[PDB]
Amino acid sequence: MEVIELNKCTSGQSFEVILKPPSDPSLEEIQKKLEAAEERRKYQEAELLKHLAE
Amino acid sequence: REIVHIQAGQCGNQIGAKFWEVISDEHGIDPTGSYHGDSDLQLERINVYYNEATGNKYVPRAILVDLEPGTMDSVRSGPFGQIFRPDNFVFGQSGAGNNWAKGHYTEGAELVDSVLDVVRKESESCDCLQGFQLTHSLGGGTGSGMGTLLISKIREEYPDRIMNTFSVMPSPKVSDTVVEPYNATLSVHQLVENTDETYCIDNEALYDICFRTLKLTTPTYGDLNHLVSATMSGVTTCLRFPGQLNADLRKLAVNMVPFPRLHFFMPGFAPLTSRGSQQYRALTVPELTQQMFDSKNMMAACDPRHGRYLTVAAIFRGRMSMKEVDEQMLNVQNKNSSYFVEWIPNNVKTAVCDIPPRGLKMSATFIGNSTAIQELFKRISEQFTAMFRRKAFLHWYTGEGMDEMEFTEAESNMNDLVSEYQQYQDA
Amino acid sequence: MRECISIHVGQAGVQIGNACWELYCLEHGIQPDGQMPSDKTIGGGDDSFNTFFSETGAGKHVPRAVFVDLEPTVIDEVRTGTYRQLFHPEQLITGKEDAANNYARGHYTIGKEIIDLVLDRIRKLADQCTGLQGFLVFHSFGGGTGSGFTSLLMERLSVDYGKKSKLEFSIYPAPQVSTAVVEPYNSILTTHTTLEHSDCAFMVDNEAIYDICRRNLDIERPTYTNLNRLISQIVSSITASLRFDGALNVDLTEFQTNLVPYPRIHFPLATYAPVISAEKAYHEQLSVAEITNACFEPANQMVKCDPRHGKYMACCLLYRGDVVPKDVNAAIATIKTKRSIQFVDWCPTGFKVGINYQPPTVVPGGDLAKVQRAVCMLSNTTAIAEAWARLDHKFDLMYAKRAFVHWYVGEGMEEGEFSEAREDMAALEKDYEEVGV
Amino acid sequence: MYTFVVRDENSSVYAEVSRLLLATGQWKRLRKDNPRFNLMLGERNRLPFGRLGHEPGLVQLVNYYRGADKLCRKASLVKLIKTSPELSESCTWFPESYVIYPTREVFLAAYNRRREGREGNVWIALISSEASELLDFIDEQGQVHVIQKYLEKPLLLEPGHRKFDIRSWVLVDHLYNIYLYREGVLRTSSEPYNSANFQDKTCHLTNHCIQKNYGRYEEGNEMFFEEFNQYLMDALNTTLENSILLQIKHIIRSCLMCIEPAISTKHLHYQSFQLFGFDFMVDEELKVWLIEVNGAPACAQKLYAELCQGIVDVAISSVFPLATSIFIKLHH
């Protein structure tokens, strides 16, 4: 029912209509997690090369 | 994203040669390497399998390996023989005697480093090598023993690249020697560890397709390799032609292989054709879909109703209704839902390519990861054990330095593979 | 005037960026060489469209955009296509090999190799900004780059641009057009890692767009081109307030204030009408009432769900075309007496309405017909949580057998991040349930 | 072959429906959690409606209406009747009811004008004339339960001076057609009605299990319509259709037209039907009152066959066709 904050301009209008009232990680932490993943990839690869050397 | 192709041994090189013949025709490359096709789609991703040279010549990125020169002289004499890079022919003289051990430990060891030199020369040229495909049999000596030795060494030098094989499985119905179950069992153990993707091409299945379906009373290796080349063309379609998908070997592995060791695919093809026989009637999309899922169109002699599909890839080739392909593909899943594991949602994916293969207006190629593939490994396991319990024919192997333990281990690893497939069939 | 930088990540984001920027150009009268005759302030300006376009002394209007993909094929088509002259080469960033549909390959192994290059190219656009508002980030949930690289990009933007808003446009995975079996994994992983870093996210379920194309455009088998041109229209509706004179949603901060009263529940549902085929030779033009009513039919939503069985926390109507407040209020009063629209008790029951008089623009020889009036409704309803339920179920089915997990552990990810991401989704679903009943 | 899944192993009604489906030769039953189904006969508690209608190439149907629990819980049905202008509040076929919480003053207001008027002032959860024991009861229980004006002058069948309720079975299909099964059942007391002792349990509560005289006057304390209509003719010079069934049809049509906008699946990506049990009370002036609406009703053993076959005909085969109508369509 109540229209409010009606704003008009050349290219449009806006307004609000109410029907009833109511009733992060740091850079070092990221570069730490990215480097923990790389170590893990490196380890996994060393195991593969050790296995193929056997 | 370049692929380096290796073909090893008699079988490896015969199907390998037929592969380059078939795709060279699809891409419009003559036997001299000059392109005389008609559509830019044939060149858009020719980089995947061909190097360019002076005069804009296309040279297969292909390495030809054998421990005896016989079959490689035959390739050089063949129709497309003049297309391959001469330096990429790497052969010894002594042969391998259908002996895995000669391929892997003795004769093949003399020759392996020269093969790796050529592989390295081809890899070093690649803008961005995606990986390797190997063609070989598992029942002989060179492709089986030396092929898997190559795979081991390639992985050492290129550990972060994809290894893909087309591996022909021995069958008493198409048999050179009684030791094929030994050679296949020792190779399957290698394949389980050191490839991401192997197409299980089963000479039992190919023999049966030629006899029962194709009406070929006495099939030849030529009739079997016609089925193989049609399958190898189909399963590489998405690698060679531009599509919505723009597929590579690694995304294929990521989506087809839910568990590292279970990477043995069952390929299928429709419509099935014998050589020289031309089919004049088109298959409707419903017939392509029914036939391509038919047990009788499978290249691994396994009954898929005896297992369950982990993942499925289906590639359709030709001018056809994409809507009809979707409905028919969906229709297969809904009507047979029990045969697709419920714990991988939407595990059947579809690709379409406008270019049909030679001589067909429509075709379908099927790549299934079914737990029914265990049937193949159990069949080889039984044949292996029948000999091994009496230690029969083993001297051919202990005379090249192998020990019985290595056989015991190989058997055990393959039985483990079988029960692992069994584990997901009851899940 | 405050600038906004658009970042398009992976195939889905890049291709949708193409669609939107083509449309922005037609809407603002910018030619493909980047010239804009109607703009008389040569070399610069602080007009509303300069929110999305910088200016060169030679009159070129350059999108404040960066495209980033881990593989060159898709951005290579921007580099050669109709709008090639629009973008500076430094704005188009490609690697050599993609994430292979694998969140962990996009986030960790490959993402770590290219994050610094992307941030410096972004830094080069931010430096041209007198008052940067924040970022609009376009990507798929399911792609490995889309999911894995975006989440890393989002973590860093929070670090480098701490006080700037970040909006997402996120393509939710549908099996009819996806070809990756692992998209539930990627979706959960990226949603978990990004949630704290995103202020407001518009999810677009490809399943919803696909059926709208089938049903309303009579397209037997929609392509990415069909889907993206329709998506770009919705995106245009949402961003129009940043690019045009107006009083409603004028800065990114305003999207969060108007649509998101609780930080984690920041996925507004979008509904768009009318979608009419260009092939339709006879078409009766739909009224304000008809198209506002269409906003509460689930068949017009960007995600299929039933808002009748949730609760609203906020609701905006964005009209384009011949629309005046009288007709909107008349239409709203009728709808209220005929539909199930319950708000949470701690929010007023109401609509924030914006009207731009220029009717929607359509790509010549595209699929959408030109209409006399259109509307995009942005409502924050708990009903959208059905999409989390669907996704989480598919995730649980696969993870219970650890299917495909080895592909992620092999890029250096830990199995624990799967259950960490899934626990967060579980908490998300429970937040929506509390608010919703 | 169409496909269906079964997620309510206790449903007497759909146990039969799935046997009928299977014995058609054109329906295959799937494992519970297989998502590639045509028909879901679902769980009663937390049926995942949000997962329905997202399988391409499958029209999906479910035997429950999301939101219909507003009509099928006693607390919700009261709120729905007082707030919806389509019914409220001088809705004249529902007993004056009030919701009450344990951790009410409106209810005391009518109870006190009841006492000041010295009228019949007995209510029900469980029955009493003093609100204090109705409330001293409510809190030593631990749950929400409405209390309701107890009908002190109920129609009583003879011989027996006995009370009863009428259960009607109503099927609502995916088109929101409202189908009333032509067979109803009367669930009788076999104990004579006793105005002077409400603690005395059996003669007031007409529940088929809560009769444990059971069977004296007719098999299973169930009188079907042929006999009840005959009785109303010989006893009262009227028919069942005229004196009772018009009001039952009005109440059913009214209740279901009310929630139509909130539960209809007309434009939805998945479709619903649902079977309901309406429970009625008839007073000595032959006025029908709604007692209660039951969302997962059982049937009566005589009628299981006919009704379930009709659930297939109108609700399932209308959506998935195969390769003398037991319902009355209530028009709207």
Ligand SMILES: Nc1nc2c(ncn2[C@@H]2O[C@H](COP(=O)(O)OP(=O)(O)OP(=O)(O)O)[C@@H](O)[C@H]2O)c(=O)[nH]1
């Ligand atoms: N709506 C829409 N969805 C797309 C588009 N392209 C891809 N998708 C969807 O996005 C998902 C796949 O993610 P992509 O963006 O293609 O993958 P990516 O981000 O490039 O990551 P990788 O290829 O894995 O390195 C699937 O669900 C597709 O259906 C597009 O252009 N429009």
Ligand SMILES: Nc1ncnc2c1ncn2[C@@H]1O[C@H](COP(=O)(O)OP(=O)(O)CP(=O)(O)O)[C@@H](O)[C@H]1O
């Ligand atoms: N206001 C009222 N006036 C008279 N009798 C009433 C009444 N409310 C309930 N009853 C009696 O109480 C019995 C049970 O009532 P309720 O209405 O609580 O259903 P139930 O949950 O007990 C089983 P169903 O769901 O099958 O009805 C009815 O059979 C009826 O005889």
Ligand SMILES: Nc1nc2c(ncn2[C@@H]2O[C@H](COP(=O)(O)OP(=O)(O)O)[C@@H](O)[C@H]2O)c(=O)[nH]1
């Ligand atoms: N399908 C097919 N199988 C073959 C071919 N040649 C050999 N085989 C099979 O491969 C096995 C023999 O191995 P082969 O390749 O000849 O031994 P190698 O030369 O040492 O590698 C046997 O099982 C044969 O049946 C062929 O051309 N096609």
Ligand SMILES: COc1ccc2c(c1)CCCN2c1nc(C)nc2onc(C)c12
């Ligand atoms: C079961 O989910 C699949 C199956 C396969 C694939 C994908 C997903 C994604 C892209 C790669 N990919 C494919 N890769 C190749 C070389 N050929 C193919 O043919 N069809 C498909 C599909 C396909």
Ligand SMILES: [Ca+2]
């Ligand atoms: Ca200017």
Ligand SMILES: [Mg+2]
């Ligand atoms: Mg041989």
Ligand SMILES: [Mg+2]
């Ligand atoms: Mg990509």
Ligand SMILES: [Mg+2]
């Ligand atoms: Mg009850």
